[PDB]
PDB file of C-alpha atoms and ligand atoms in Angstrom:
ATOM      1  CA  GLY A   1     -29.234  95.041  27.561  1.00  0.00           C
ATOM      2  CA  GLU A   2     -29.375  93.392  25.361  1.00  0.00           C
ATOM      3  CA  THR A   3     -29.338  90.125  27.262  1.00  0.00           C
ATOM      4  CA  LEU A   4     -28.143  86.750  26.039  1.00  0.00           C
ATOM      5  CA  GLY A   5     -31.746  85.548  26.275  1.00  0.00           C
ATOM      6  CA  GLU A   6     -32.956  88.281  23.922  1.00  0.00           C
ATOM      7  CA  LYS A   7     -30.309  87.226  21.395  1.00  0.00           C
ATOM      8  CA  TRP A   8     -31.537  83.649  21.706  1.00  0.00           C
ATOM      9  CA  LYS A   9     -35.132  84.796  21.152  1.00  0.00           C
ATOM     10  CA  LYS A  10     -34.167  86.730  18.018  1.00  0.00           C
ATOM     11  CA  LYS A  11     -32.450  83.673  16.537  1.00  0.00           C
ATOM     12  CA  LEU A  12     -35.362  81.424  17.540  1.00  0.00           C
ATOM     13  CA  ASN A  13     -37.733  83.743  15.670  1.00  0.00           C
ATOM     14  CA  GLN A  14     -35.503  83.534  12.569  1.00  0.00           C
ATOM     15  CA  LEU A  15     -35.735  79.724  12.214  1.00  0.00           C
ATOM     16  CA  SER A  16     -37.748  78.010   9.494  1.00  0.00           C
ATOM     17  CA  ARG A  17     -40.245  75.306  10.441  1.00  0.00           C
ATOM     18  CA  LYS A  18     -37.838  72.412   9.818  1.00  0.00           C
ATOM     19  CA  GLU A  19     -34.940  74.152  11.573  1.00  0.00           C
ATOM     20  CA  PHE A  20     -37.225  74.983  14.512  1.00  0.00           C
ATOM     21  CA  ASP A  21     -38.553  71.426  14.789  1.00  0.00           C
ATOM     22  CA  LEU A  22     -34.986  70.044  14.778  1.00  0.00           C
ATOM     23  CA  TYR A  23     -33.617  72.638  17.195  1.00  0.00           C
ATOM     24  CA  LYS A  24     -36.381  72.456  19.811  1.00  0.00           C
ATOM     25  CA  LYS A  25     -35.583  68.806  20.650  1.00  0.00           C
ATOM     26  CA  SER A  26     -31.812  68.808  20.063  1.00  0.00           C
ATOM     27  CA  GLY A  27     -30.105  67.218  23.069  1.00  0.00           C
ATOM     28  CA  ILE A  28     -33.108  67.455  25.414  1.00  0.00           C
ATOM     29  CA  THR A  29     -34.725  64.813  27.616  1.00  0.00           C
ATOM     30  CA  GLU A  30     -38.333  63.810  27.042  1.00  0.00           C
ATOM     31  CA  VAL A  31     -40.721  61.158  28.269  1.00  0.00           C
ATOM     32  CA  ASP A  32     -42.388  58.790  25.838  1.00  0.00           C
ATOM     33  CA  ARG A  33     -46.070  59.800  26.000  1.00  0.00           C
ATOM     34  CA  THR A  34     -47.356  57.407  23.299  1.00  0.00           C
ATOM     35  CA  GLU A  35     -48.809  54.794  25.650  1.00  0.00           C
ATOM     36  CA  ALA A  36     -50.245  57.362  28.064  1.00  0.00           C
ATOM     37  CA  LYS A  37     -51.893  59.315  25.239  1.00  0.00           C
ATOM     38  CA  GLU A  38     -53.521  56.156  23.893  1.00  0.00           C
ATOM     39  CA  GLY A  39     -54.773  55.389  27.409  1.00  0.00           C
ATOM     40  CA  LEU A  40     -56.313  58.847  27.750  1.00  0.00           C
ATOM     41  CA  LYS A  41     -57.918  58.474  24.320  1.00  0.00           C
ATOM     42  CA  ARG A  42     -59.648  55.323  25.628  1.00  0.00           C
ATOM     43  CA  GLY A  43     -60.824  56.929  28.855  1.00  0.00           C
ATOM     44  CA  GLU A  44     -58.505  54.883  31.070  1.00  0.00           C
ATOM     45  CA  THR A  45     -58.304  56.275  34.605  1.00  0.00           C
ATOM     46  CA  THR A  46     -55.383  54.432  36.243  1.00  0.00           C
ATOM     47  CA  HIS A  47     -51.579  54.672  35.913  1.00  0.00           C
ATOM     48  CA  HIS A  48     -51.427  57.355  33.201  1.00  0.00           C
ATOM     49  CA  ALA A  49     -50.213  60.885  33.760  1.00  0.00           C
ATOM     50  CA  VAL A  50     -52.649  63.331  32.172  1.00  0.00           C
ATOM     51  CA  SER A  51     -49.804  65.433  30.742  1.00  0.00           C
ATOM     52  CA  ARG A  52     -46.032  65.575  30.350  1.00  0.00           C
ATOM     53  CA  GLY A  53     -46.192  67.840  33.406  1.00  0.00           C
ATOM     54  CA  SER A  54     -46.181  64.998  35.937  1.00  0.00           C
ATOM     55  CA  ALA A  55     -42.699  63.887  34.843  1.00  0.00           C
ATOM     56  CA  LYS A  56     -41.576  67.507  34.654  1.00  0.00           C
ATOM     57  CA  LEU A  57     -42.480  68.161  38.296  1.00  0.00           C
ATOM     58  CA  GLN A  58     -41.092  64.771  39.315  1.00  0.00           C
ATOM     59  CA  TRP A  59     -37.662  65.935  38.111  1.00  0.00           C
ATOM     60  CA  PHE A  60     -37.711  68.768  40.676  1.00  0.00           C
ATOM     61  CA  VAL A  61     -39.160  66.647  43.487  1.00  0.00           C
ATOM     62  CA  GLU A  62     -36.625  63.840  43.115  1.00  0.00           C
ATOM     63  CA  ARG A  63     -33.885  66.449  43.687  1.00  0.00           C
ATOM     64  CA  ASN A  64     -35.629  67.910  46.777  1.00  0.00           C
ATOM     65  CA  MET A  65     -35.857  71.301  45.017  1.00  0.00           C
ATOM     66  CA  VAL A  66     -39.513  71.392  45.985  1.00  0.00           C
ATOM     67  CA  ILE A  67     -40.827  68.840  48.478  1.00  0.00           C
ATOM     68  CA  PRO A  68     -44.630  68.653  48.296  1.00  0.00           C
ATOM     69  CA  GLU A  69     -46.259  68.170  51.677  1.00  0.00           C
ATOM     70  CA  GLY A  70     -49.433  68.972  53.579  1.00  0.00           C
ATOM     71  CA  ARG A  71     -51.931  71.093  51.683  1.00  0.00           C
ATOM     72  CA  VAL A  72     -50.807  71.591  48.075  1.00  0.00           C
ATOM     73  CA  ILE A  73     -52.352  74.376  45.989  1.00  0.00           C
ATOM     74  CA  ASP A  74     -51.851  74.094  42.212  1.00  0.00           C
ATOM     75  CA  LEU A  75     -52.543  77.413  40.468  1.00  0.00           C
ATOM     76  CA  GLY A  76     -53.406  76.910  36.818  1.00  0.00           C
ATOM     77  CA  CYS A  77     -53.658  73.147  37.211  1.00  0.00           C
ATOM     78  CA  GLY A  78     -55.012  72.573  33.677  1.00  0.00           C
ATOM     79  CA  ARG A  79     -55.563  68.859  33.101  1.00  0.00           C
ATOM     80  CA  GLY A  80     -54.020  68.221  36.522  1.00  0.00           C
ATOM     81  CA  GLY A  81     -50.596  66.599  35.857  1.00  0.00           C
ATOM     82  CA  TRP A  82     -48.894  68.327  38.797  1.00  0.00           C
ATOM     83  CA  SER A  83     -51.846  67.736  41.136  1.00  0.00           C
ATOM     84  CA  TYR A  84     -52.156  64.018  40.423  1.00  0.00           C
ATOM     85  CA  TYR A  85     -48.397  63.538  40.781  1.00  0.00           C
ATOM     86  CA  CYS A  86     -48.424  65.225  44.202  1.00  0.00           C
ATOM     87  CA  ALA A  87     -51.456  63.221  45.348  1.00  0.00           C
ATOM     88  CA  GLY A  88     -49.334  60.054  45.415  1.00  0.00           C
ATOM     89  CA  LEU A  89     -46.626  61.507  47.678  1.00  0.00           C
ATOM     90  CA  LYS A  90     -46.674  60.253  51.266  1.00  0.00           C
ATOM     91  CA  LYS A  91     -46.222  63.668  52.914  1.00  0.00           C
ATOM     92  CA  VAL A  92     -49.070  65.271  50.915  1.00  0.00           C
ATOM     93  CA  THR A  93     -52.452  65.394  52.659  1.00  0.00           C
ATOM     94  CA  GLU A  94     -54.606  67.484  50.297  1.00  0.00           C
ATOM     95  CA  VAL A  95     -54.367  68.816  46.733  1.00  0.00           C
ATOM     96  CA  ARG A  96     -56.469  71.764  45.527  1.00  0.00           C
ATOM     97  CA  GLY A  97     -56.107  72.720  41.865  1.00  0.00           C
ATOM     98  CA  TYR A  98     -57.574  75.856  40.268  1.00  0.00           C
ATOM     99  CA  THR A  99     -57.729  76.536  36.546  1.00  0.00           C
ATOM    100  CA  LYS A 100     -59.638  78.699  34.082  1.00  0.00           C
ATOM    101  CA  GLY A 101     -60.920  75.973  31.748  1.00  0.00           C
ATOM    102  CA  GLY A 102     -63.581  76.890  29.226  1.00  0.00           C
ATOM    103  CA  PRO A 103     -63.068  77.557  25.519  1.00  0.00           C
ATOM    104  CA  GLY A 104     -59.442  77.525  24.482  1.00  0.00           C
ATOM    105  CA  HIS A 105     -58.135  76.129  27.788  1.00  0.00           C
ATOM    106  CA  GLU A 106     -57.551  72.672  29.249  1.00  0.00           C
ATOM    107  CA  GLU A 107     -60.174  71.240  31.591  1.00  0.00           C
ATOM    108  CA  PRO A 108     -59.288  69.052  34.590  1.00  0.00           C
ATOM    109  CA  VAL A 109     -59.125  65.388  33.592  1.00  0.00           C
ATOM    110  CA  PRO A 110     -60.787  62.990  36.087  1.00  0.00           C
ATOM    111  CA  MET A 111     -58.471  60.120  37.034  1.00  0.00           C
ATOM    112  CA  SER A 112     -58.187  57.359  39.628  1.00  0.00           C
ATOM    113  CA  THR A 113     -54.409  57.313  39.911  1.00  0.00           C
ATOM    114  CA  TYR A 114     -52.963  56.784  43.382  1.00  0.00           C
ATOM    115  CA  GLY A 115     -54.261  59.338  45.855  1.00  0.00           C
ATOM    116  CA  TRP A 116     -57.010  60.663  43.568  1.00  0.00           C
ATOM    117  CA  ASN A 117     -59.430  60.871  46.513  1.00  0.00           C
ATOM    118  CA  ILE A 118     -57.464  63.738  48.121  1.00  0.00           C
ATOM    119  CA  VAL A 119     -57.498  65.844  44.905  1.00  0.00           C
ATOM    120  CA  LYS A 120     -60.078  68.505  44.100  1.00  0.00           C
ATOM    121  CA  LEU A 121     -59.650  70.211  40.710  1.00  0.00           C
ATOM    122  CA  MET A 122     -61.819  73.294  40.161  1.00  0.00           C
ATOM    123  CA  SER A 123     -62.350  74.766  36.688  1.00  0.00           C
ATOM    124  CA  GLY A 124     -63.860  78.153  35.904  1.00  0.00           C
ATOM    125  CA  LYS A 125     -61.443  79.857  38.301  1.00  0.00           C
ATOM    126  CA  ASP A 126     -59.366  82.884  37.315  1.00  0.00           C
ATOM    127  CA  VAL A 127     -56.419  82.695  39.686  1.00  0.00           C
ATOM    128  CA  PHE A 128     -55.666  86.384  39.192  1.00  0.00           C
ATOM    129  CA  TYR A 129     -58.759  87.182  41.302  1.00  0.00           C
ATOM    130  CA  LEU A 130     -58.569  84.188  43.672  1.00  0.00           C
ATOM    131  CA  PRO A 131     -58.066  85.161  47.345  1.00  0.00           C
ATOM    132  CA  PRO A 132     -54.896  83.541  48.716  1.00  0.00           C
ATOM    133  CA  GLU A 133     -55.311  80.540  50.986  1.00  0.00           C
ATOM    134  CA  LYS A 134     -53.057  78.925  53.551  1.00  0.00           C
ATOM    135  CA  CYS A 135     -51.010  76.119  52.043  1.00  0.00           C
ATOM    136  CA  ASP A 136     -47.892  74.103  52.751  1.00  0.00           C
ATOM    137  CA  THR A 137     -46.958  73.769  49.076  1.00  0.00           C
ATOM    138  CA  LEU A 138     -47.650  76.339  46.333  1.00  0.00           C
ATOM    139  CA  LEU A 139     -47.293  75.286  42.690  1.00  0.00           C
ATOM    140  CA  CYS A 140     -47.874  77.427  39.627  1.00  0.00           C
ATOM    141  CA  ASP A 141     -47.141  76.467  36.034  1.00  0.00           C
ATOM    142  CA  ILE A 142     -48.728  79.459  34.270  1.00  0.00           C
ATOM    143  CA  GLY A 143     -47.156  81.404  31.430  1.00  0.00           C
ATOM    144  CA  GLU A 144     -48.240  81.764  27.810  1.00  0.00           C
ATOM    145  CA  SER A 145     -45.393  82.011  25.321  1.00  0.00           C
ATOM    146  CA  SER A 146     -45.246  84.643  22.588  1.00  0.00           C
ATOM    147  CA  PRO A 147     -42.786  85.436  19.788  1.00  0.00           C
ATOM    148  CA  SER A 148     -42.548  88.865  21.451  1.00  0.00           C
ATOM    149  CA  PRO A 149     -40.226  88.873  24.495  1.00  0.00           C
ATOM    150  CA  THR A 150     -41.836  92.118  25.729  1.00  0.00           C
ATOM    151  CA  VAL A 151     -45.280  90.497  25.744  1.00  0.00           C
ATOM    152  CA  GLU A 152     -43.741  87.581  27.670  1.00  0.00           C
ATOM    153  CA  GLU A 153     -42.119  90.047  30.074  1.00  0.00           C
ATOM    154  CA  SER A 154     -45.492  91.509  31.037  1.00  0.00           C
ATOM    155  CA  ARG A 155     -47.090  88.046  31.285  1.00  0.00           C
ATOM    156  CA  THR A 156     -44.248  86.803  33.510  1.00  0.00           C
ATOM    157  CA  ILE A 157     -44.321  89.795  35.862  1.00  0.00           C
ATOM    158  CA  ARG A 158     -48.111  89.467  36.101  1.00  0.00           C
ATOM    159  CA  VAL A 159     -47.717  85.801  37.117  1.00  0.00           C
ATOM    160  CA  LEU A 160     -45.088  86.674  39.737  1.00  0.00           C
ATOM    161  CA  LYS A 161     -47.288  89.437  41.170  1.00  0.00           C
ATOM    162  CA  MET A 162     -50.225  87.007  41.354  1.00  0.00           C
ATOM    163  CA  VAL A 163     -48.322  84.170  43.052  1.00  0.00           C
ATOM    164  CA  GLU A 164     -46.489  86.212  45.695  1.00  0.00           C
ATOM    165  CA  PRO A 165     -49.444  86.634  48.150  1.00  0.00           C
ATOM    166  CA  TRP A 166     -49.599  82.816  48.342  1.00  0.00           C
ATOM    167  CA  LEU A 167     -45.985  82.481  49.552  1.00  0.00           C
ATOM    168  CA  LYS A 168     -45.279  82.354  53.296  1.00  0.00           C
ATOM    169  CA  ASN A 169     -43.155  79.721  55.060  1.00  0.00           C
ATOM    170  CA  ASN A 170     -44.119  77.150  52.429  1.00  0.00           C
ATOM    171  CA  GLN A 171     -42.648  75.024  49.666  1.00  0.00           C
ATOM    172  CA  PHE A 172     -43.104  76.352  46.151  1.00  0.00           C
ATOM    173  CA  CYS A 173     -42.385  75.700  42.484  1.00  0.00           C
ATOM    174  CA  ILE A 174     -43.332  78.551  40.111  1.00  0.00           C
ATOM    175  CA  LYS A 175     -42.790  78.765  36.364  1.00  0.00           C
ATOM    176  CA  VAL A 176     -40.935  81.855  35.133  1.00  0.00           C
ATOM    177  CA  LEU A 177     -41.859  81.995  31.443  1.00  0.00           C
ATOM    178  CA  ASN A 178     -39.286  84.623  30.465  1.00  0.00           C
ATOM    179  CA  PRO A 179     -36.536  84.909  33.099  1.00  0.00           C
ATOM    180  CA  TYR A 180     -34.015  86.848  31.007  1.00  0.00           C
ATOM    181  CA  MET A 181     -35.663  90.232  30.500  1.00  0.00           C
ATOM    182  CA  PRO A 182     -34.022  92.751  32.864  1.00  0.00           C
ATOM    183  CA  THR A 183     -37.259  93.823  34.581  1.00  0.00           C
ATOM    184  CA  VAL A 184     -38.062  90.177  35.312  1.00  0.00           C
ATOM    185  CA  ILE A 185     -34.548  89.665  36.698  1.00  0.00           C
ATOM    186  CA  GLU A 186     -35.043  92.615  39.076  1.00  0.00           C
ATOM    187  CA  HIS A 187     -38.411  91.276  40.264  1.00  0.00           C
ATOM    188  CA  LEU A 188     -36.866  87.835  40.827  1.00  0.00           C
ATOM    189  CA  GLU A 189     -34.043  89.333  42.889  1.00  0.00           C
ATOM    190  CA  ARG A 190     -36.553  91.094  45.143  1.00  0.00           C
ATOM    191  CA  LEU A 191     -38.627  87.901  45.345  1.00  0.00           C
ATOM    192  CA  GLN A 192     -35.577  85.867  46.319  1.00  0.00           C
ATOM    193  CA  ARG A 193     -34.817  88.457  48.990  1.00  0.00           C
ATOM    194  CA  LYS A 194     -38.336  88.077  50.430  1.00  0.00           C
ATOM    195  CA  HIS A 195     -38.902  84.344  50.021  1.00  0.00           C
ATOM    196  CA  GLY A 196     -35.598  82.637  49.261  1.00  0.00           C
ATOM    197  CA  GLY A 197     -35.302  79.874  46.698  1.00  0.00           C
ATOM    198  CA  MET A 198     -33.460  79.713  43.405  1.00  0.00           C
ATOM    199  CA  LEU A 199     -34.076  79.634  39.649  1.00  0.00           C
ATOM    200  CA  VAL A 200     -33.537  76.229  37.996  1.00  0.00           C
ATOM    201  CA  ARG A 201     -33.705  74.906  34.439  1.00  0.00           C
ATOM    202  CA  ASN A 202     -35.651  71.649  33.907  1.00  0.00           C
ATOM    203  CA  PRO A 203     -33.929  69.383  31.320  1.00  0.00           C
ATOM    204  CA  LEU A 204     -37.349  68.262  30.041  1.00  0.00           C
ATOM    205  CA  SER A 205     -37.955  71.817  28.821  1.00  0.00           C
ATOM    206  CA  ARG A 206     -37.600  72.154  25.073  1.00  0.00           C
ATOM    207  CA  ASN A 207     -34.922  74.373  23.577  1.00  0.00           C
ATOM    208  CA  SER A 208     -37.731  76.538  22.125  1.00  0.00           C
ATOM    209  CA  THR A 209     -38.539  77.902  25.588  1.00  0.00           C
ATOM    210  CA  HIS A 210     -36.280  79.764  28.022  1.00  0.00           C
ATOM    211  CA  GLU A 211     -38.627  78.925  30.902  1.00  0.00           C
ATOM    212  CA  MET A 212     -37.067  78.334  34.306  1.00  0.00           C
ATOM    213  CA  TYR A 213     -38.657  77.482  37.635  1.00  0.00           C
ATOM    214  CA  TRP A 214     -38.385  79.412  40.880  1.00  0.00           C
ATOM    215  CA  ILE A 215     -38.145  76.643  43.483  1.00  0.00           C
ATOM    216  CA  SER A 216     -38.056  77.073  47.232  1.00  0.00           C
ATOM    217  CA  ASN A 217     -35.131  74.917  48.351  1.00  0.00           C
ATOM    218  CA  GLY A 218     -31.598  76.272  48.205  1.00  0.00           C
ATOM    219  CA  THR A 219     -30.114  79.500  46.919  1.00  0.00           C
ATOM    220  CA  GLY A 220     -27.886  80.851  44.174  1.00  0.00           C
ATOM    221  CA  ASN A 221     -27.136  83.700  41.788  1.00  0.00           C
ATOM    222  CA  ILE A 222     -30.197  84.285  39.597  1.00  0.00           C
ATOM    223  CA  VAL A 223     -28.391  86.252  36.871  1.00  0.00           C
ATOM    224  CA  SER A 224     -25.641  83.631  36.621  1.00  0.00           C
ATOM    225  CA  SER A 225     -28.155  80.790  36.317  1.00  0.00           C
ATOM    226  CA  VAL A 226     -30.220  82.593  33.654  1.00  0.00           C
ATOM    227  CA  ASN A 227     -27.095  83.409  31.654  1.00  0.00           C
ATOM    228  CA  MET A 228     -25.966  79.767  31.886  1.00  0.00           C
ATOM    229  CA  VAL A 229     -29.253  78.670  30.329  1.00  0.00           C
ATOM    230  CA  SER A 230     -28.981  81.356  27.645  1.00  0.00           C
ATOM    231  CA  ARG A 231     -25.486  80.227  26.649  1.00  0.00           C
ATOM    232  CA  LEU A 232     -26.579  76.578  26.524  1.00  0.00           C
ATOM    233  CA  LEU A 233     -29.593  77.360  24.329  1.00  0.00           C
ATOM    234  CA  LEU A 234     -27.526  79.640  22.094  1.00  0.00           C
ATOM    235  CA  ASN A 235     -24.828  77.016  21.590  1.00  0.00           C
ATOM    236  CA  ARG A 236     -27.452  74.430  20.680  1.00  0.00           C
ATOM    237  CA  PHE A 237     -28.300  76.443  17.537  1.00  0.00           C
ATOM    238  CA  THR A 238     -24.961  75.509  15.939  1.00  0.00           C
ATOM    239  CA  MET A 239     -24.282  72.216  17.765  1.00  0.00           C
ATOM    240  CA  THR A 240     -24.757  69.232  15.472  1.00  0.00           C
ATOM    241  CA  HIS A 241     -28.312  68.004  16.007  1.00  0.00           C
ATOM    242  CA  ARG A 242     -28.598  65.393  18.745  1.00  0.00           C
ATOM    243  CA  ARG A 243     -31.574  63.105  19.081  1.00  0.00           C
ATOM    244  CA  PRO A 244     -33.370  63.642  22.405  1.00  0.00           C
ATOM    245  CA  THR A 245     -32.910  61.219  25.280  1.00  0.00           C
ATOM    246  CA  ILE A 246     -36.215  59.319  25.588  1.00  0.00           C
ATOM    247  CA  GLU A 247     -37.247  58.080  29.026  1.00  0.00           C
ATOM    248  CA  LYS A 248     -40.246  56.129  30.225  1.00  0.00           C
ATOM    249  CA  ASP A 249     -43.162  58.228  31.426  1.00  0.00           C
ATOM    250  CA  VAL A 250     -44.214  58.202  35.071  1.00  0.00           C
ATOM    251  CA  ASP A 251     -46.564  55.518  36.410  1.00  0.00           C
ATOM    252  CA  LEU A 252     -48.955  57.157  38.881  1.00  0.00           C
ATOM    253  CA  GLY A 253     -50.515  53.892  40.053  1.00  0.00           C
ATOM    254  CA  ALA A 254     -54.096  53.402  41.156  1.00  0.00           C
ATOM    255  CA  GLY A 255     -56.493  53.477  44.071  1.00  0.00           C
ATOM    256  CA  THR A 256     -57.445  55.606  47.047  1.00  0.00           C
ATOM    257  CA  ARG A 257     -55.239  56.790  49.904  1.00  0.00           C
TER     258      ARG A 257
HETATM  259  C1  NSC B   1     -54.399  75.908  24.560  1.00  0.00           C
HETATM  260  C2  NSC B   1     -53.827  75.947  25.973  1.00  0.00           C
HETATM  261  C3  NSC B   1     -52.461  76.054  26.179  1.00  0.00           C
HETATM  262  C4  NSC B   1     -51.957  76.088  27.455  1.00  0.00           C
HETATM  263  N1  NSC B   1     -50.529  76.201  27.684  1.00  0.00           N
HETATM  264  C5  NSC B   1     -52.820  76.015  28.524  1.00  0.00           C
HETATM  265  C6  NSC B   1     -52.384  76.044  29.846  1.00  0.00           C
HETATM  266  C7  NSC B   1     -53.294  75.960  30.901  1.00  0.00           C
HETATM  267  N2  NSC B   1     -52.815  76.008  32.291  1.00  0.00           N
HETATM  268  C8  NSC B   1     -53.057  77.300  32.942  1.00  0.00           C
HETATM  269  O1  NSC B   1     -52.735  77.536  34.040  1.00  0.00           O
HETATM  270  N3  NSC B   1     -53.720  78.288  32.104  1.00  0.00           N
HETATM  271  C9  NSC B   1     -54.114  79.654  32.399  1.00  0.00           C
HETATM  272  C10 NSC B   1     -53.784  80.328  31.591  1.00  0.00           C
HETATM  273  C11 NSC B   1     -53.988  81.552  31.534  1.00  0.00           C
HETATM  274  C12 NSC B   1     -54.743  82.333  32.555  1.00  0.00           C
HETATM  275  N4  NSC B   1     -55.113  83.503  32.796  1.00  0.00           N
HETATM  276  C13 NSC B   1     -55.774  84.041  33.737  1.00  0.00           C
HETATM  277  C14 NSC B   1     -56.043  85.552  33.682  1.00  0.00           C
HETATM  278  C15 NSC B   1     -56.242  83.237  34.799  1.00  0.00           C
HETATM  279  C16 NSC B   1     -55.969  81.804  34.810  1.00  0.00           C
HETATM  280  N5  NSC B   1     -56.476  80.993  35.912  1.00  0.00           N
HETATM  281  C17 NSC B   1     -55.216  81.257  33.712  1.00  0.00           C
HETATM  282  C18 NSC B   1     -54.762  79.900  33.385  1.00  0.00           C
HETATM  283  C19 NSC B   1     -54.640  75.860  30.630  1.00  0.00           C
HETATM  284  C20 NSC B   1     -55.070  75.839  29.314  1.00  0.00           C
HETATM  285  C21 NSC B   1     -54.173  75.907  28.266  1.00  0.00           C
HETATM  286  N6  NSC B   1     -54.649  75.878  27.018  1.00  0.00           N
END
């Protein structure tokens, strides 16, 4: 070291509140969640995504980076945004979501968006002790940020260690909270050797996170991709502020499959 990502993290931790709030959205893409949030406030159960996560996963799926099919397991499903998005996909036959829930954590949100009847979301489940199950698609969006990159390093490696027993001849999309710490890079290189895939930056991620996703389809140089993200995020500190690109949120429809 020290890595480009660690330099980015230092500068991020130096920002004031107003500088941070400007920087985190500068030049990013984001979905307009206003209508959806009002719908959830009213208890509406059709069309709305339960989180910004549905659109986030959609970005990967529309580029065939992960192609949900068959039995989908969603580790750390939270409200269920990834699960309910997958439930509407023709090739998907079953969605099982597991999440901790309870105090301080999001509970699954019951919905009747398209394909809801093939979704089972289970709260009260600690995925770090959950025996691996056969699945055709493995999703995991777990990783708690911290101002400390070393804390994030341990959290990230713990997530990667937990998800690996679930991976075998299947599609996957796994969040890598901190991909730039050298120990994480080494684990990712061994993981790519065992299971393939590639590390990709989602443009709906805010500039305040260096998160990248390990997706199953394709290949590439992990260090080069991480460093590309680090340079982008570093340059956005001094780039003139740019308003984010606002897109419409996803419409997940209604009814049973
Ligand atoms: C306040 C808050 C913030 C988040 N980013 C959350 C994410 C989630 N999504 C997750 O996957 N969370 C999560 C988060 C941390 C976890 N830790 C262990 C040891 C086991 C788990 N099954 C587990 C799950 C859930 C609740 C959240 N609550």
